[PDB]
User: Fold fimbrin-like protein from Arabidopsis thaliana.
Amino acid sequence: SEKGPFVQHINRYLGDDPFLKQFLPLDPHSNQLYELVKDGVLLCKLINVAVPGTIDERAINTKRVLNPWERNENHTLCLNSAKAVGCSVVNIGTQDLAEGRPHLVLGLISQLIKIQLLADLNLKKLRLPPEKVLLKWMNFHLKKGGYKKTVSNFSADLKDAQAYAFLLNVLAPEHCDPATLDAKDPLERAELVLSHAERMNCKRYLTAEEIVEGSSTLNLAFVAQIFHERNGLNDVETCRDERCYRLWINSLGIDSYVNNVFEDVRNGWILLEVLDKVSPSSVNWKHASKPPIKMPFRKVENCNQVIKIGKQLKFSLVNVAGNDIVQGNKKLILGLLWQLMRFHMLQLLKSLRSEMTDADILSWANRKVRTMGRKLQIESFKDKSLSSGLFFLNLLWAVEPRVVNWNLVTKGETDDEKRLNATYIVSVARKLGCSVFLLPEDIVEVNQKMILILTASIMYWSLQR
Assistant:
């Protein structure tokens, strides 16, 4: 039933796209949606609408006609990009997009809209969910707007359009319509509210009836849209790692979802799940307690098994124990996660045989590039020259020359040029099948740990061609 708003959403945010400009608008009553998704250009672009700068559009096969492979690349690039923004696509396959399965297409678009509308609510200018943060923002302006009532929900507290009218008058007074004051019926007030929003260029698409009926999901979106158009407002590696491992854990096929690794990992359950995935049958669930957990004993017990299995896998854990995870030791949590990530990567590569090391990966990359006739090599994954992005592009070109367009590549000199290749590298790698989560700046600044994993991931898919 959400097909309608989902279409209107696409038509409004992509209706001017140079490529999709001709295929839009789409009839929310017809099945044109499931047809425009088959090639893989639509969803890839929707993702950048949700989180700008995610996919380098230059890496998207944007031709009139596409081969069954140029088509498969877009979906590959799409699904891997979706994970990079927090989407749960562990059950959606590349062929499901090509065919256009509704329950999977709508389910995917649903997550993107959510990400698009509710993100940037924790990075603006602190334990409250995005929705509650939006409520604080709204009430903030309403206070100064002399609004008496307080908003605490997006259904009954908005049904009469009163709060909408005040808010809009506060954020965009130059678009005020005194007619709202003569509005007797709540529907009439809503229609005028929608107009006021249209004037300030919000890409609003809900109707006056959807406001009076108190539709919680539709109204929440509208309030977010107002915010994004006018908010009316006048140790950093820890934050990056938090995002990185959070995205990685959520793509492993785990049953729990991570919103914040530092917090959601304290009762030990999630870490046990990751361990069971990366090292099958390693966890003894008979001695573990499933959340919610109130009893602290059960928390400490889970974390102690986490540490035990960690040491059994030969990981490096000194002067720590289960209660360190429960206490939120970020230094230990990041250290344990890294080793888990590296362990899984090596195990994956190892399964391609018939005792992997970082050095074997370094050797493979250098050797792989030498087969194309190029002489550029690296001494390690910390090599300063990596920042240019030239090595990676050559390696990727070596793996599959068809995925690297050199007219699009630049020199790795200026910080801008490097930034450009980096973003291109991340998208091309995902286009191949690499499920990586490093940031473009991870290449420009040469984050050796992230470098290792990207390379190992390229290798992983190269050895299966």
User: Anything to note?
Assistant: The two ends are 41 Å apart (CA to CA).
